Amino acid sequence: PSGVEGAAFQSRLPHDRMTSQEAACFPDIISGPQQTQKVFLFIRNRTLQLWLDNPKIQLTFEATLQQLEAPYNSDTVLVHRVHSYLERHGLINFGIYKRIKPLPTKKTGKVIIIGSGVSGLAAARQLQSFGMDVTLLEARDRVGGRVATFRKGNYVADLGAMVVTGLGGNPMAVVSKQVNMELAKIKQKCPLYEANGQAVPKEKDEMVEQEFNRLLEATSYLSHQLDFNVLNNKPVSLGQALEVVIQLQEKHVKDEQIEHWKKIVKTQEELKELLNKMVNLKEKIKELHQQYKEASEVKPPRDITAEFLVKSKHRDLTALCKEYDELAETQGKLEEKLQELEANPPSDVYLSSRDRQILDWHFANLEFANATPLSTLSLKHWDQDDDFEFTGSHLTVRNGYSCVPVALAEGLDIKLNTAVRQVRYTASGCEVIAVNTRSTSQTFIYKCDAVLCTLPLGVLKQQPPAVQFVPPLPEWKTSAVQRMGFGNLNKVVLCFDRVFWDPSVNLFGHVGSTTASRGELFLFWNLYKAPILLALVAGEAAGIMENISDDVIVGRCLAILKGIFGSSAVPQPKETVVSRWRADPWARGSYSYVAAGSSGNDYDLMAQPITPGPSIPGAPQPIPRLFFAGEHTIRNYPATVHGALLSGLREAGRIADQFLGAMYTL
C-alpha cells in the first residue's frame, strides 16, 4: 500500500477506521461525527508516515504540526493528542533514533525490567525515553535472550531468532533502517532429498505437498464446520485430527475399491446366469436338430403330417437359433463391460511408504513452525494469528541478528550476570531480589515502583520455580502459564572451509526414515557469506537430541550431507555448534505455541499486569505493579522477535500511562 494509507499498513493499523486502542484515548472522536474521525485518521496516518519516512531521528510535535496543512493543522490540540498517543504507544519514536530534545535531566518513577531480551530492551528504551529510571536485570552475560548469535573468526550463525518474516507491516523494518542489519532475501526454492540422498522427483514433491495442504484444510474443516474439538473429554490436537483425516482417506480408498470389485461381481454374475441360458439352448438345440434330422430321414413322398414335422421342427429350430444368437450378443456386451471395469481399477493405496515419508517432512515443518510435536498443538487455534502475517519475502540478517539487541542495549543500565530469584510486589512498591550468577552468594535487592517481567514462558513454568513471586501469582495467571505451550527447536551449525553445496539455493530438505524422526535434521539453511550450513532439529527430535553429544549429532549431519552430495564432497566442519534451548535455564525452551486446551486468549491473560492487595485493610485499591512482556504475551504476534519487541512497546506505554499519567485523553 502507498501514501498515508501505506503508513497505517506499515504500522499494522487500518487506514480508514479507528482501532479499539484509539477509541480508548479518543472516545470523544469515535463517538463523534464522521468528519472529525476522518480528520483524526488523517493526522494518525500522516504522523505515522512522517515518522516512517525517517525513523532515524525523533519526530517532535513541532515538526509534525509544521508539516500538517489546513484543514488538519488548524486544530493543534488534536494534533498534540494524536502525536502523543502515537509516541506513547511506540508507533513513532521507538527504536534507535537521534533524540532531538535531549533526555529529561531528572527522572520520574523507577522500573525494574527482568531480562534483556528484545522485549525487555524494547521497553527499557521506551521507558527511559519517557523520563523514567529503568534498569534491567539479566541472568546471562549478554543481551538478546533468544536472539543468540554464534561468532568465530569470519563465521556468524544465529542459534535463536534468524529470519525476519517479511517487512510488510513489520516493526523490524523501522529497526533495520535505524541499524546496520545486512538483510538478505531468502529464496523460495527448497528441494527435498529422501533418506537415500537423492531428490524427490518433481512428480512426488508436488503430489505430497498438495495432499499435505488438503489434509490441513480438512483438519480446519473438521474443527470449524464439524466442531470436532473434543474427543474422550480431551481437546483434539492437530496431530490427532490429521490422523482422523488420513484414516478417513484410507477408509475411502478401500470403500471405493470394494464397490468397484462389487461391480465386477455384479457383472461376472450376469455373465454367469447368461452362460447358463446359453448352455441350455445349445442343448435344447442339440436335440431339436436330432429330431429334425430324423424327421428328414423319412424320404418323400410324405403324408402331410410327416411333412409338417419336418417343417415345424425346422421353424422351431431356427427360433431357438435366433435366441442363442441374440444371447451371444448380450454375452459379447457383458464380456466387454468386464475388462472395462477390470482395466479401470480405482486407487490402490492412499499413500505409499515413500509418500508418507515425504508427507512427514511437511509435518516436521509444522512441528518446526510451532516448535512442538503436532500432538500438543490446539486443533482449533494453533494458527490463530495467521491474519497478522506480514507481506513480502522473508529475510536473514547476514551480520548476525544479535546486532539488533546489542544496538538496542546502547544507552541502558543493564546488570548482566544478575539472576532474579524473588519478585516481591506490594501496595507501596516492589523489591526484586537477585543473585550474581558467578558467586550466587552475592545477593542484590532492587526497589522499584513497578517490575516489567519478560521471563521466558518456559522459565515461568519451572516446577520448582526459578523465581518466586511474593505474593504468589493469582490463579488466573498461573493457569494461563500451565495451559499455554512452550515448545522447543534446536539448531546445528556447520562451518566448512569450502562451499560444497548449491550456493544459490538458500535451503533444502532432508526426508527422514521414520515418522518418529521426522524432525531430526529435516531442513538445512545456506544463509551466510562464509561456508556455513545450518540444520534444524524440530518436533519430537528436538527434545531427544539434547541428550546426544555434538559429535553423534554432527555425525548424523555429515552423513546426510554425504549421502546427498557425495561421501567425498563433504569435508570435516572446521567448527560446530549445537543449541540446546530446552536445557538452557534462562529459556527452558524455544518459543510458545497454542497448546491443545489453550487459545489465543491465554496470550492475553499473560499480558494482564498484576495488582497487589492493599497493605492497610480498607485502603483504596492499588495501582498495578507487576507488568509482563515477551513473545508469549502478544496474541497477534506470538513466538517471534517482532512480536516480542511489540510487546515491550505495549508494556512501556502501559507502565508510563500508569506512573506518568496520560495527558492525551481529555
Partner: protein, 133 residues
C-alpha cells in the same frame, strides 16, 4: 461450507474412527477382509464362467440350417391348407411361425386363411383345442 474436493469427511464417518482407540484400525481391517472376500468371489465366478464358456465351444454352428428363399405365393395348394391347420393346431395365433412352416405365404396370407376357411377348416375347435395346452 464443504471439505477440499476428494476428502471424505462426512459427519457419520468421523465418530466411526474416533468412537474408541482402534475403532480406526478396526473398521479398516473390516474393509480389508471385505476386499479379499469379494476378490476370491470374483475369481470363483471367473472360474465357474470359464467352465460354462468352454461347454459352449462350437457355438450352435453344427446345428444351423440354410435359408429357404421362396417367393410368397398367392394360392393355397391343398397341401399348404393342411400345413396350415397343423401349424394352427401347434402354434395357435402365431401368424408368423405359421408363415414359416407353410413357407411360401406372408404373415398376412396366414390371417386371411383364418376367416376365409373359417367354416370349412374348423379353426375355432382347432384354436380351442390348442388352448387345452
Amino acid at each position: 461450507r464443504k471439505p477440499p474436493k476428494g476428502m471424505f469427511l462426512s459427519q457419520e464417518d468421523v465418530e466411526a474412527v474416533s468412537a474408541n482407540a482402534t475403532a480406526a484400525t478396526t473398521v479398516l481391517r473390516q474393509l480389508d477382509m471385505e476386499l479379499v472376500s469379494v476378490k476370491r468371489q470374483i475369481q470363483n465366478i471367473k472360474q465357474t464362467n470359464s467352465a460354462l464358456k468352454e461347454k459352449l465351444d462350437g457355438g450352435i454352428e453344427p446345428y444351423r440350417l440354410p435359408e429357404v428363399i421362396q417367393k410368397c405365393n398367392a394360392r393355397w395348394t391343398t397341401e399348404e391348407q393342411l400345413l396350415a391347420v397343423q401349424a394352427i393346431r401347434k402354434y395357435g395365433r402365431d401368424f408368423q411361425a405359421i408363415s414359416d412352416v407353410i413357407g411360401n405365404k406372408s404373415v398376412v396370407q396366414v390371417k386371411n386363411f383364418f376367416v376365409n376357411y373359417r367354416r370349412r377348416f374348423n379353426i375355432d375347435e382347432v384354436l380351442q383345442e390348442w388352448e387345452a395346452e
